[PDB]
Amino acid sequence: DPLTTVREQCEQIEKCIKARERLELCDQRVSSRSQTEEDCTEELFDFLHARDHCVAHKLFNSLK
Amino acid sequence: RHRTKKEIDQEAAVEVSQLRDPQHDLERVKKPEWVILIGVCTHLGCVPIANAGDFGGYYCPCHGSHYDASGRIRKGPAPLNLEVPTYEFTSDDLVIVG
Amino acid sequence: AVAASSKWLEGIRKWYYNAAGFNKLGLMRDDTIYEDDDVKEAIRRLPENLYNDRVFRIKRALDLTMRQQILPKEQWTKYEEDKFYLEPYLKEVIRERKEREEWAKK
Amino acid sequence: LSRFLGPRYRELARNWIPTASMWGAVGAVGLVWATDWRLILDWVPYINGKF
Amino acid sequence: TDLELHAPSYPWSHRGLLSSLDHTSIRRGFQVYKQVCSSCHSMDYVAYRHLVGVCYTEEEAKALAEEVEVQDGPNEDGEMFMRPGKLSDYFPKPYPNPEAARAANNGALPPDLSYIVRARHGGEDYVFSLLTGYCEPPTGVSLREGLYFNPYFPGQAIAMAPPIYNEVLEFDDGTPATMSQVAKDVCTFLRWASEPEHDHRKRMGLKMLMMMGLLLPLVYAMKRHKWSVLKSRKLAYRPPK
Amino acid sequence: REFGHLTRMRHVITYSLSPFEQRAFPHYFTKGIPNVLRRTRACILRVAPPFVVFYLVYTWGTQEFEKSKRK
Amino acid sequence: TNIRKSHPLMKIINNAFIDLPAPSNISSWWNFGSLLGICLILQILTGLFLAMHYTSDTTTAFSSVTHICRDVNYGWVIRYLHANGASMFFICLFIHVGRGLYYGSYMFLETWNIGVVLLFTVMATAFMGYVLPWGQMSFWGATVITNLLSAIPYIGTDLVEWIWGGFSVDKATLTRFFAFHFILPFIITALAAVHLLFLHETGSNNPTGISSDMDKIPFHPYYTIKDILGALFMMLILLILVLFSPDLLGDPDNYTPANPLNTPPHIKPEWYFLFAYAILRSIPNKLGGVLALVASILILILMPMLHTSKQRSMMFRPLSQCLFWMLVADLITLTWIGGQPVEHPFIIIGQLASILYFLIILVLMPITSIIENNLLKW
Ligand code: HEC
Ligand code: HEM
Ligand code: HEM
Ligand code: FES
């Protein structure tokens, strides 16, 4: 639960929004045609790495 | 292995020239429907997880190497095919493999 | 083999003299050679005034090194004041050895 | 090199190639017996030392 | 040819230099293993003789030996009977043989949990980042009938089903039993099982930096007062004129 | 090969002094610090250039391996 | 009379280290031979308890190691001494061998040749030892090398069955590998009293080149209290590493239990064979590869017969100083390359780096020393 509150607090910084913007552009193109090749695992990987890096500094403070 | 004949035909459907080391299974084992195998891979030795392989053989993720079902190599850097164990099919139901 | 470039051979020889560093310890070029069975002979063919000097230039410059220091700058062995004292005694021990060896061959 | 060049060292070499040849022959044949070398133990069927 | 995500670094209370393991996250971590993890995983190297002084009192964990009684072997005329269990006995193993595991768990043998900490790049922060990770499958990836998606796992698809969420367990104390804190107190229990030495040796590395301190500038003094005769000698050479 | 049979040597003199009559650190931080200087100076013009090269190749190689998988 | 001189037994230790002439300017780079002497001696007292409680059986091979770590009193201390006191032993040995070359110390024909035999003997002892613990790297080194000595022209087939003592790795494996890894240390404490008996007839060298009989000094007390300071400074470094960060050097692939079946993902050796592994992997074919791996130990022998110089040592030689540092910088590029996959860009650097190890030694140091001779007229 305390993690559930902090994740969106740590998504607020712009280090993680830009890669988030990148994810959608290929995501809609891939689903637009069943003939595309890209699987968005790569564009997924940038977003989780940046998010979980900034979560680290804080979450242990906002525990119990 | 008590091999299924469909897998022998899968093995015999292979085109000879592409093969890295010429070792056809019909001369390797006097029994197409039986096979005897040693785990070690010719390049380094690592042993795959059981029931793996796109082509129906063995898959060593050590260097992306794929070994064939009867003990053959198709992709590098593995030099040659799997060594054939010493054996003698003397008894029809009590096999002497070595 | 060259003449107009012999000014340049002099130029490179004065640079390599300073880069190697035996002059900051007082030594001279002949003090550094490696003593094999042929240089061990040509040493006991020296007069006494020449042999005594060589044993003090080799004991003062092997004490400066135990102390990790160097001699003052006014006492550095110049370039045009180094005399080759052991050269003539060494061409003669050698050419007497090519003679004892082409006798066993003929 | 030049210290060893001459006719006398070549003469000693051709004089003692009997020594080198016998030394090498005895060494090679002994290296067969020592390590239970079956691969040359069979080249002569006369030593049936393998039981 | 697929990339792998690396767990970040967290500020543990036992992280470096001189700081120890707090025995409350470990006292509250066996229970999370006991009532969740165990019925599949083994702890064969780990025995009940070990916990007499780390997390529980001698009889407090002795009473946990009676909770389950292990099958026994050959005794007189009626062997294969059951014994209540005592201090010596090991962590009871779930199956008759490990080969039963492929039967029920889809042909996926569960890894043992004695060295899982040391046998991994990452460490005690790879496991933690595994637990909270479970995510959504992206657009355009197929899966088997019995597989799950995780961007940390090298194959990105693991058989195991998420075993922690909210309100799973009841702590004996009353701390809010939430996913965030159950995961932390598991990553602390396993580490101490990987090493029982992690706290004895941080104390022999501080009483030794002091013996060296006292004795390593006193040999330096003797050495220096033998080489002064030798370091202050002048010299001559007046030859005969 | 012991001390009385090693060489012959002439007209030279030496002037020792006792250990209990002097001090072990005459000047500890006024000589040692300018000493390390001339040493290192004179020599770090032919020890560093070789090790710059291994750094240039190291950064060129991990860069290529990274961008061949992650586009 | 004088007791030491006239007693038949004390008379021998008095000529060896109490009273022999020694040079005045010997540096601290001459302290490593005695460290090796200290280093060799730990490894036999440790290695005693690792067989006394050790069990030689195939079934318990993985489990005997993890067992001894916790159950045995003071076993967690002594186990990491055997594995960390053997990475020390190999850093006092590349320092010792390097030092001799710089100061021209190979003009002792007797002792520079008894030393290259000691260098093969300790390579072998180390390479059995990695293969005892058995776990999913000991097995997957063993297959690689063991297999490749089967490409001998006429004998390779016959050898892999004897060392296996079976078709392959088997219960007998503990019996033999322990048998030959046990034996090796005791032949090495014999070729060391002979390596030193050929040196007590010329004495030491010194970092100048020139020969110094006009000021010798006893060996007591001047180098028996500089040798103690050295060894203490060493126990200090060896103990920061096993009471603070023991696991910094190994690999976390060893632990995974004994399985014939499992596949190790990323095979690679311990850090001090990673320059050998980069040679063998650089060349196509079985038979040419094994020849390029024995070449290096065998190259040190061509040392004294390539010397072209009027002076001994590199102290007074600027041009030949620079190369020294190149051979060394280029033996750091064979340790980085060898601990990774073959690679798209790692094959081109990877086998350019190797030849150069060969080019400089066999072609470029002999030529460059001549331009120095010609440039100061001998
Ligand atoms: C019987 C169901 C089951 C449950 C419930 C269960 N485990 Fe697992 N565990 C498994 C299986 C099956 C695997 C992986 C086997 C495989 O992938 O081949 C596994 C893997 C693991 C791993 C390693 C994960 C990895 O990626 O390698 C750990 C650690 C572990 N279990 C401990 C635990 C913990 C801690 C819990 C409670 C959060 C738990 N087990 C609950 C069966 C279970
Ligand atoms: C130069 C000397 C030696 C070296 C370099 C050396 C090296 C090694 C190494 C690297 C290991 C790996 C084990 C691990 O990673 O924990 C090992 C294990 C072992 N060594 Fe040695 N060793 C030496 C001398 C000896 C001696 C004299 C013995 C005498 C019995 C010995 C007995 C053992 C044993 C029994 C193991 C068991 C494997 C284990 O317990 O992990 N070693 N050695
Ligand atoms: C177990 C291995 C070894 C031991 C115990 C050992 C020990 C020693 C010792 C104690 C000395 C005394 C002189 C000094 O301390 O400088 C010495 C000198 C020497 N060693 Fe070794 N050594 C070993 C390996 C080697 C190797 C591998 C070589 C390879 C060439 C070598 C070559 C030499 C040489 C040339 C000297 C001459 C010393 C000088 O230049 O003055 N040794 N060694
Ligand atoms: S089978 Fe050769 S490296 Fe894996």
Side-chain angles (χ1 to χ4, degrees), chain E residues 29-41:
Chain E
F30 187 18
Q31 300 164 337
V32 185
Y33 159 80
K34 173 183 269 288
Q35 281 96 20
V36 189
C37 329
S38 169
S39 309
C40 175
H41 289 285

Side-chain angles (χ1 to χ4, degrees), chain E residues 36-37 40-41 105 108-111 113 130-131 158 160 163-164 186:
Chain E
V36 189
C37 329
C40 175
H41 289 285
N105 293 82
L109 285 167
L113 297 188
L130 208 58
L131 282 177
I158 194 55
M160 187 183 184
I164 65 174
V186 182

Side-chain angles (χ1 to χ4, degrees), chain F:
Chain F
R1 215 174 191 275
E2 68 275 16
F3 285 95
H5 288 156
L6 275 152
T7 299
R8 55 165 275 257
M9 191 171 139
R10 299 294 295 164
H11 297 105
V12 300
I13 318 169
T14 81
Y15 293 111
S16 167
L17 171 60
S18 193
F20 289 87
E21 295 281 336
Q22 51 178 349
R23 299 168 291 127
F25 311 83
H27 322 90
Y28 195 52
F29 291 135
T30 315
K31 182 181 72 178
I33 289 166
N35 199 35
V36 135
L37 214 130
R38 192 228 348 126
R39 312 235 254 130
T40 247
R41 188 292 270 199
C43 196
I44 207 139
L45 156 64
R46 70 187 73 100
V47 183
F51 290 84
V52 169
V53 163
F54 168 68
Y55 177 94
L56 300 197
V57 170
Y58 171 88
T59 190
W60 186 89
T62 67
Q63 174 192 69
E64 295 290 326
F65 186 60
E66 188 274 332
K67 83 182 289 291
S68 81
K69 293 189 288 183
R70 325 172 77 176
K71 100 185 180 181

Side-chain angles (χ1 to χ4, degrees), chain G residues 40 43-44 47-48 50-51 54 65 68 79 82-83 86 89-90 122 125-126 129-133 178 181-182 185 188 254 270 272:
Chain G
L40 186 105
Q43 291 293 76
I44 293 171
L48 248 234
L50 274 192
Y54 195 56
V65 162
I68 191 167
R79 188 206 181 276
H82 210 83
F89 185 78
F90 280 80
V122 298
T125 300
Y130 206 21
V131 176
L132 296 186
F178 194 28
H181 172 101
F182 199 118
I188 289 159
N254 221 29
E270 54 280 45
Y272 45 78

Side-chain angles (χ1 to χ4, degrees), chain G residues 29-34 36-37 40 89 93 96-97 99-101 105-106 108 111-112 115-116 118-119 122 188 192 195-196 199 203-206 300:
Chain G
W29 287 126
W30 280 264
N31 216 138
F32 298 101
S34 186
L36 281 172
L40 186 105
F89 185 78
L93 189 85
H96 188 70
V97 164
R99 176 278 274 152
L101 257 92
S105 276
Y106 44 74
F108 292 157
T111 53
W112 178 268
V116 181
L118 274 156
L119 182 52
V122 298
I188 289 159
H195 170 81
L196 294 175
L199 187 81
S204 295
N205 190 23
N206 69 75
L300 292 179

